Amino acid sequence: RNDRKVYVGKVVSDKMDKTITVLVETYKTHKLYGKRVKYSKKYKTHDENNSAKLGDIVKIQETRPLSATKRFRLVEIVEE
Amino acid sequence: ARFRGSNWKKSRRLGISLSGTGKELEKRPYAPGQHGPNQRKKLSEYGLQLREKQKLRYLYGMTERQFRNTFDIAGKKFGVHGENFMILLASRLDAVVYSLGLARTRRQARQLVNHGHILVDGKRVDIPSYSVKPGQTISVREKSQKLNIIVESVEINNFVPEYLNFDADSLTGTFVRLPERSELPAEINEQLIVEYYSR
Amino acid sequence: PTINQLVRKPRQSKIKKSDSPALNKGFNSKKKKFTDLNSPQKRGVCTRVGTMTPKKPNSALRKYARVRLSNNIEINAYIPGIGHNLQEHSVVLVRGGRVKDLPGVRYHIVRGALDTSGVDGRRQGRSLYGTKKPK
Amino acid sequence: TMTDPIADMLTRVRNANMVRHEKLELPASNIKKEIAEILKSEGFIKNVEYVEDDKQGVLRLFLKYGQNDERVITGLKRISKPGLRVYAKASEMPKVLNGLGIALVSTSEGVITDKEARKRNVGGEIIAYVW
Amino acid sequence: FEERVVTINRVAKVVKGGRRFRFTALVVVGDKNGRVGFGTGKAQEVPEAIKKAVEAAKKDLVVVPRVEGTTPHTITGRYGSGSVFMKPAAPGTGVIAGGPVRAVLELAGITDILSKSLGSNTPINMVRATIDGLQNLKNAEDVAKLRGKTVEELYN
RNA sequence: CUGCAUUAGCUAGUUGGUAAGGUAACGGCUUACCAAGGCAACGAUGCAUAGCCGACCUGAGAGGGUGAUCGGCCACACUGGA
RNA sequence: GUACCUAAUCAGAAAGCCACGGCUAACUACGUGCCAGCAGCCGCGGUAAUACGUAGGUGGCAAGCGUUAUCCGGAAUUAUUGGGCGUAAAGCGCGCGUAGGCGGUUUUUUAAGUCUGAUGUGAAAGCCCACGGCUCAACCGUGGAGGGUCAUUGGAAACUGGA
RNA sequence: GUAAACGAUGAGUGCUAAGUGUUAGGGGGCCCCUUAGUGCUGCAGCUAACGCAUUAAGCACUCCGCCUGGGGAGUA
RNA sequence: GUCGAAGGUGGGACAAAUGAUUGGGGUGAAGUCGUAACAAGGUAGCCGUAUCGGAAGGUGCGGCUGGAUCACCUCCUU
Numbered sequence A: 001r002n003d004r005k006v007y008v009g010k011v012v013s014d015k016m017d018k019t020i021t022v023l024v025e026t027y028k029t030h031k032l033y034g035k036r037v038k039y040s041k042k043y044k045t046h047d048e049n050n051s052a053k054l055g056d057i058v059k060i061q062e063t064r065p066l067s068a069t070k071r072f073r074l075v076e077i078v079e080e
Numbered sequence B: 001a002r003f004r005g006s007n008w009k010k011s012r013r014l015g016i017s018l019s020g021t022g023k024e025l026e027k028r029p030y031a032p033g034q035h036g037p038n039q040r041k042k043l044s045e046y047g048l049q050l051r052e053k054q055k056l057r058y059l060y061g062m063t064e065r066q067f068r069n070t071f072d073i074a075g076k077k078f079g080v081h082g083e084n085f086m087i088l089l090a091s092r093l094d095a096v097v098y099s100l101g102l103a104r105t106r107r108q109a110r111q112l113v114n115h116g117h118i119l120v121d122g123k124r125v126d127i128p129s130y131s132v133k134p135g136q137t138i139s140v141r142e143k144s145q146k147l148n149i150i151v152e153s154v155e156i157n158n159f160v161p162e163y164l165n166f167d168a169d170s171l172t173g174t175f176v177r178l179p180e181r182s183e184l185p186a187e188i189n190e191q192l193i194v195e196y197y198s199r
Numbered sequence C: 001p002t003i004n005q006l007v008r009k010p011r012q013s014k015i016k017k018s019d020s021p022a023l024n025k026g027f028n029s030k031k032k033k034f035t036d037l038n039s040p041q042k043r044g045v046c047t048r049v050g051t052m053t054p055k056k057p058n059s060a061l062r063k064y065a066r067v068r069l070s071n072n073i074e075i076n077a078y079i080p081g082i083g084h085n086l087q088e089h090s091v092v093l094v095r096g097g098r099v100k101d102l103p104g105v106r107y108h109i110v111r112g113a114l115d116t117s118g119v120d121g122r123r124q125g126r127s128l129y130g131t132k133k134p135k
Numbered sequence D: 001t002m003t004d005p006i007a008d009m010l011t012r013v014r015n016a017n018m019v020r021h022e023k024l025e026l027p028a029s030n031i032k033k034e035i036a037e038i039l040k041s042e043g044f045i046k047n048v049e050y051v052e053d054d055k056q057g058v059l060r061l062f063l064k065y066g067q068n069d070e071r072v073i074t075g076l077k078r079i080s081k082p083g084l085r086v087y088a089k090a091s092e093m094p095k096v097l098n099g100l101g102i103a104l105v106s107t108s109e110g111v112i113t114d115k116e117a118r119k120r121n122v123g124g125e126i127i128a129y130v131w
Numbered sequence E: 001f002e003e004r005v006v007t008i009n010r011v012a013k014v015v016k017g018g019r020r021f022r023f024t025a026l027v028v029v030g031d032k033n034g035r036v037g038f039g040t041g042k043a044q045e046v047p048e049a050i051k052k053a054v055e056a057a058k059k060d061l062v063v064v065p066r067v068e069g070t071t072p073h074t075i076t077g078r079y080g081s082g083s084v085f086m087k088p089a090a091p092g093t094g095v096i097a098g099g100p101v102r103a104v105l106e107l108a109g110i111t112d113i114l115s116k117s118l119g120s121n122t123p124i125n126m127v128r129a130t131i132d133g134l135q136n137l138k139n140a141e142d143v144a145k146l147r148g149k150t151v152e153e154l155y156n
Numbered sequence F: 001c002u003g004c005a006u007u008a009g010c011u012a013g014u015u016g017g018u019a020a021g022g023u024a025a026c027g028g029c030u031u032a033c034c035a036a037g038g039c040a041a042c043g044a045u046g047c048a049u050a051g052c053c054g055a056c057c058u059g060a061g062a063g064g065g066u067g068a069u070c071g072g073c074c075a076c077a078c079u080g081g082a
Numbered sequence G: 001g002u003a004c005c006u007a008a009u010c011a012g013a014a015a016g017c018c019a020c021g022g023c024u025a026a027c028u029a030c031g032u033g034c035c036a037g038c039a040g041c042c043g044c045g046g047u048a049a050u051a052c053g054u055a056g057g058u059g060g061c062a063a064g065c066g067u068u069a070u071c072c073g074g075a076a077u078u079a080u081u082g083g084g085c086g087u088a089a090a091g092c093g094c095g096c097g098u099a100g101g102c103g104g105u106u107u108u109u110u111a112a113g114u115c116u117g118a119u120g121u122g123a124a125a126g127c128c129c130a131c132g133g134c135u136c137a138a139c140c141g142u143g144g145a146g147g148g149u150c151a152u153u154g155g156a157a158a159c160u161g162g163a
Numbered sequence H: 001g002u003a004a005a006c007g008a009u010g011a012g013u014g015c016u017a018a019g020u021g022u023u024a025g026g027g028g029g030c031c032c033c034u035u036a037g038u039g040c041u042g043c044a045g046c047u048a049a050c051g052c053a054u055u056a057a058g059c060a061c062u063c064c065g066c067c068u069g070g071g072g073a074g075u076a
Numbered sequence I: 001g002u003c004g005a006a007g008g009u010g011g012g013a014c015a016a017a018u019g020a021u022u023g024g025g026g027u028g029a030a031g032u033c034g035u036a037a038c039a040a041g042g043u044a045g046c047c048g049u050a051u052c053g054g055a056a057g058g059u060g061c062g063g064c065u066g067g068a069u070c071a072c073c074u075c076c077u078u
């Protein structure tokens, strides 16, 4: 029933075995001056078969802890 | 009352008859003190606002803290702040008793209510600060129905404003509705007091 | 500045200094250290008592005391009023407020507190000089 | 180089109005044309002509002056800018000069005035103030 | 026409021996019905300085559009370094203003308004800034006529 | 959700994988092996200071200051470990 | 045996603090004579002191009144709202150039920003509005309103972002 | 690696009356028009004033650098 | 037997206090010496740099006008 968060982002490193780091990009607004400023967050996601490659836009979903800092699993490769 | 001072000196200072008779200003309409006579200085804007505020405050025989609190609560009502403040000051049990005429002086009415000779809706009220509201009745304690002071004041037939409906046979007054600016004393420019409390 | 410049380097307000720094500090003897605490007054012991000459154009022999406070800071405190009963080793209460004539005198000695006596013969504004009501 | 064509257009209008010029020619764009049409509909300018030539086309505005030579346009102010963009909700739409002026807005329902934005209950990017 | 003396200032011109002192008076004049003006007068004594200032002020008057004792809309009047922000209020607010601004507004007849001197507090330039704001004020009917519409069309 | 660059490099169970052990529980949580990964000018690391919040004071507002009493959450019980 | 109520006696037991040169409401006389002393700033005091001390009077408050300490305001004096850089403080001595910020006109598409509706939640107490109960009020109680840059979901495509 | 390294005036971009010189060009009939500089005079507008004013210090947008009382001190 | 608090030993890091003595800074009363700057301030001043001198400062090189001025020529504006 209850679903888990899903994010879309680019792959920025895959040197780790079966792990890819996904950079999700957002734009937080400055609290006083109100300007739009870029905000990047890197997500460590599980890539069982090493399908994803450095550069492709992939999709990840939140899971239980899988490692010291892995909390996401690769769902599909939206683009490449 | 709480301010037990020379009401004549206060009337002379403020250029107003706090009693309403004018006796204080009849002979010496100038300020008290060594420099009273031959006083010719001109008040500043702050001085004028302060004098207006003091006129109203000493007219209603209140302390500064209570006066300020009443002004604050009046400001929260819908309408014109100054008019609301004036009608709220009028609604006080001291003012209602004095207008009904159970005493010849505002301070005398204050002492009456303080000593409990008055009843609102048939129940004792010792606090002159009590804020009367429309639809209520002011009576007199049975043990004090025959007081010389109250009976003499009732005999002296004073004018009863429109917002008060009085019957001297029963010594029973009714607060019909809220007063109006015309009914309330015109010697006060409430805008000056509003500005005084603005700064 | 541009909005981008403000985002990169936000505006920075001027920092405010106290006029009575010596009152903002307590001392912990056990840890042998200073601590930041705002006090309205501090007790002290008069290291010296005497007179100082005001800077021009004023002229006088203004009465003052050099005081070591409970926090071990040594200050100069003016003695207000006419006549005082203070000497070295007197224990006094010190409040803020400098004397404009006196350069290094940044505090006042309260009258009528601890050792300091009220002003003798004072009748108007007595509370400011620690003098009882004569009656 | 050029960074805000809308600001350039507003400043052209302001400068021409100050010098009391009658007409004003500027390079055209769809947003500029819609702004000019809103100005005409509201009565701040007299006429708007589009010249469908090469090089993106030209807009030819005709300014409006009342009796006594009084200027109908008192002032134009760019609100949203490339350096900082401004958006407002329908319930937060600002009134220019207590309603005596217009705020040109850009909305999902086209660039309209603040009155129309409030009526349709929409917000958007507050392009400019005119009064 | 009511008149209020805003400021009186003793100015000096240096001469080979001593100084020549004069009195300058800044005065505001108004009917309390939408007409206000200000004037300055210099004389060897303050009564004559005031009289000259009053004559100049009466010569120079402006008409203040109003709406039930308050201005039609918010305005910032500027002159030199003077700058006065003024904003319509509701009845019973009073005139929330300081210094020469209050003189100008009261004599113009405004009884409910909020204001703030944002610039120089020199009285003559404050008065000039306030007058500039009142001059630049606009009324609904005049703006509708200028824009070729009705008040109802203006407000939609 | 905090100050400092007159703090620019930090990290070696560190980052990932495999196996086992361990736990109410997933997990470098721990161990063995393989790899060299991980963080950082979007401020890592270091240093200094600090219980956090509902709220409280002030200000027209935007903001600024504060975190007593009362309620919630956390942490501690002479100091350290079990 | 407290609150509260009743009956009797007495104006009798119950007013102090600061200020009065301008800001800032309130002025005169004596003493002093750059001394003693005052002082938040400007300043005051050397024989005519409304500024020092006392007295009369007056002003503001009042069971409180003053002083000190600290915070916000006034301060648009860090300025998003809401400031500047010729001479007042402020354009690097000048290039070349990286990251970043920003970016000319039209067409199609996306919905990250942007706009709009629904649902859940944002405890209680508190602030604000109303009502009710203490004789009034504070206070207490009960409803309402508020507070997210919140989340999930459905819609629009003008502008910014992507193709 | 610093100068009163100055126009004591950051770069880019557009827009806003005019008159008159000069440097290097171009087009149309000594004249007119025109491009880029370099000077002077001068509107609107700006400015505390002095003054600036198509070579802005006017009107606007983008980005950078810099300022926040005087000394202490361009010092520790 | 593994882990393991405290402890011990060692060389480093950082912070605070304190130290014979020493350096300029600020303030202060009519102190002493001269008079650098402000007028062309009596040698125009100031900026960077070098060096010298009790001291302010002088001198050299380059720069600036934020410099007064009698005669001359060279142009530009009305």
Ligand SMILES: [Mg+2]
Pocket (backbone or CB within 6 Å): none
């Ligand atoms: Mg004139």
Ligand SMILES: [Mg+2]
Pocket (backbone or CB within 6 Å): none
């Ligand atoms: Mg702590």
Ligand SMILES: [Mg+2]
Pocket (backbone or CB within 6 Å): none
């Ligand atoms: Mg404010």
Ligand SMILES: [Mg+2]
Pocket (backbone or CB within 6 Å): none
């Ligand atoms: Mg502020």
Ligand SMILES: [Mg+2]
Pocket (backbone or CB within 6 Å): none
């Ligand atoms: Mg300068």
Ligand SMILES: [Mg+2]
Pocket (backbone or CB within 6 Å): none
């Ligand atoms: Mg330069």
Ligand SMILES: [Mg+2]
Pocket (backbone or CB within 6 Å): none
């Ligand atoms: Mg709640």
Ligand SMILES: [Mg+2]
Pocket (backbone or CB within 6 Å): none
């Ligand atoms: Mg330099």
Ligand SMILES: [Mg+2]
Pocket (backbone or CB within 6 Å): H008
């Ligand atoms: Mg320079």
Ligand SMILES: [Mg+2]
Pocket (backbone or CB within 6 Å): none
């Ligand atoms: Mg040219």
Ligand SMILES: [Mg+2]
Pocket (backbone or CB within 6 Å): I036, I041
């Ligand atoms: Mg000399």
Ligand SMILES: [Mg+2]
Pocket (backbone or CB within 6 Å): none
């Ligand atoms: Mg010389």
Ligand SMILES: [Mg+2]
Pocket (backbone or CB within 6 Å): I052, I058, I059
């Ligand atoms: Mg020599």
